[PDB]
Swiss-Prot record:
Name of the protein in its database record: Bifunctional cytochrome P450/NADPH--P450 reductase
Induction comment: By pentobarbital. Expression is negatively regulated by repressor bm3R1 at the transcriptional level.
Marked site: Important for catalytic activity: T264
Residues the entry annotates as binding (9Z)-hexadecenoate: Y47
Result, substituting I397E: Ineffective covalent modification of the heme macrocycle. 2-fold apparent limiting rate of flavin to heme electron transfer for arachidonate-bound enzyme
Effect of F257E: Ineffective covalent modification of the heme macrocycle. Substantially slower FMN to heme electron transfer for the arachidonate-bound enzyme. Product distribution biased towards omega-3
Substitution effect: A70G: Higher activity in the hydroxylation of highly branched fatty acids
Residue intervals passing through the bilayer: none
Effect of A260M: No effective fatty acid oxidation. No effect on electron transport from NADPH to FMN. Slightly lower high-spin conversion with arachidonate, palmitoleate, palmitate, myristate and laurate/dodecanoate
Resulting phenotype, A260C: No effective fatty acid oxidation. No effect on electron transport from NADPH to FMN
Binding-site positions, heme: C396
Annotated source species: Priestia megaterium (strain ATCC 14581 / DSM 32 / CCUG 1817 / JCM 2506 / NBRC 15308 / NCIMB 9376 / NCTC 10342 / NRRL B-14308 / VKM B-512 / Ford 19) (Bacillus megaterium)
Amino acid sequence: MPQPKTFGELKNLPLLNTDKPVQALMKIADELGEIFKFEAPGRVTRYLSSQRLIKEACDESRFDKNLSQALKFVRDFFGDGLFTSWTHEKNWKKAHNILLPSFSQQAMKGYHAMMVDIAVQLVQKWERLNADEHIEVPEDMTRLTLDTIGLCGFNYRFNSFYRDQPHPFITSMVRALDEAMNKLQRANPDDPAYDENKRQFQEDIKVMNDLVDKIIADRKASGEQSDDLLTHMLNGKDPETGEPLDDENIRYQIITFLIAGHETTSGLLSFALYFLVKNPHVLQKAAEEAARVLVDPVPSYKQVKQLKYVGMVLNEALRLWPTFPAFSLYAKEDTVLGGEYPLEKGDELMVLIPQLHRDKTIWGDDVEEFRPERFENPSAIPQHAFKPFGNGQRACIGQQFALHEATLVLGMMLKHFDFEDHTNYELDIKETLTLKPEGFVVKAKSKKIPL
Ligand code: HEM
Ligand SMILES: N#Cc1cc([N+](=O)[O-])ccc1O
Ligand code: NI
């Protein structure tokens, strides 16, 4: 099995001593091919990049979701919430059953008005800019997505469009995530030189948990009938066990959904706008759809569902830069991968999604081009070829929520503004376990259509 360059003792671990480890792993995959072994002191994983192998890795009878070293580190604040639980922990299937109805078609229709509330605030912010003012794209997308999960999920207003600096929750979240990613390359993690990285980590976790405390208090003291995600956390009973979630798990779910429910969607929106301004004919086509479909002062649920090409734009952004770029699996039993690589029970795999999405045998030779038309007919895509939301019963519970929000917001953006790649931005992808453009700015000229 191919393996990248080694450093003695340290095997491959120093290759992760970079601020952009996923992009480093993509370059190694380009050099070595569909599979390569990656060793660190005391741990081994196999990175997969071809649909040929990943389709086998996605066979749930043979492989289950693994908690990578990264996920074990963030389990310090995510606990046994849905994202950082093993499939076999009792709280995983319990919470899965209790929370899945919060993502039904009926539930999604119920979120729509509150999604519009935040989307209108974004559109108003940009409409109120003066001439020559820049838009800081990932920053405003993070304002939008954080506020949206807060309102729709928890009837809580972060009011991020009322701040010029990031919300304190965001600052701590980013530092906690970046600390976890930085802890993966530490050859000796208990070295005393990291003892205030460890101080800072615990302070950031307390910041997040204090916010969780307020959301729970506000719900407790609220004289308004909510039927949202938090209602189901606090009241729903698992049909199989008949049990509700306990208080400690509820706290972990709130942190999990606040983070998971906004960060990757902010990345997606930022990548989508980047590719639109870099591809003016695609932008024109999407804008024509937005103008043709969005005929009312605010979008309806059904109109968002009719934004077909906008949806294709988003899937093509997720193809090139899936914002949660890798997921981990382990072998449930001894097995052979691809007729060629024997695995023992417990062996770990890493699915490198950006490389899967560049498999030329699936997509053709032009895999670096931004062409939403690849998604004209979703049924033409082979099984396990396009996996931005993970796999099987451990796939993303929020996929439809993210895509509805992103389609709504991008539709309104395209209806209301012309965009300019004002600074000829050179793509710079920041990594914090998730992917996002850094430093991406545009200018937006209003088409002066009232809200
Ligand atoms: C474009 C946006 C998003 C992307 C790319 C994305 C991606 C993913 C991926 C790849 C996984 C599987 C992780 C693994 O196998 O270890 C996942 C799981 C999950 N996602 Fe998302 N996600 C997005 C939006 C959301 C939203 C909006 C929510 C909540 C409203 C959410 C909540 C979750 C949860 C709770 C899980 C764990 C599900 C389980 O294992 O039971 N995500 N997501
Ligand atoms: N989704 C999703 C997701 C995103 C993040 N994240 O953005 O950090 C963490 C955990 C998750 O399950
Ligand atoms: Ni309900």
